[PDB]
């Protein structure tokens, strides 16, 4: 049985709280506990990624600070939806749907 892991999921993404924190749902936090980390590393398709400093605090989870690195630099607001990768580490591979422009 060889499976790493693979879990996908997308995101609708409000820009007043993307601002500075990326939310992650709780259903699907519940679904993995992990150690706190100190940096997360958000992979883009074109060759860009951007280190983001996520935290897991109590019950549930932020990626707050650097995660404003990614908004902006790569320009999402209300109405863009994120698909994330997720192998079984803090890795996170993030496809960006813009709308019709970026």
Request: glycine share 6%; with cysteine.
């Amino acid at each position: 049985m060889a499976d790493t892991g693979e879990v996908q999921f997308m995101k609708p993404f409000i820009s007043e709280k993307s601002s500075k924190s990326l939310e992650i749902p709780l259903g699907f936090n519940e679904y993995f506990p992990a150690p706190f980390p100190i940096t997360v590393d958000l992979l883009d398709y074109s060759g860009r990624s951007w280190t983001v400093r996520m935290k897991k605090r109590g019950e549930k989870v932020f990626l707050t600070v650097g995660w404003e690195n990614f908004v902006k630099d790569n320009n999402l607001e209300d109405g863009k939806y994120l698909q994330f990768i997720y192998d079984r580490d803090r890795t996170f591979y993030v496809i960006i749907y813009g709308h019709n422009m970026c």
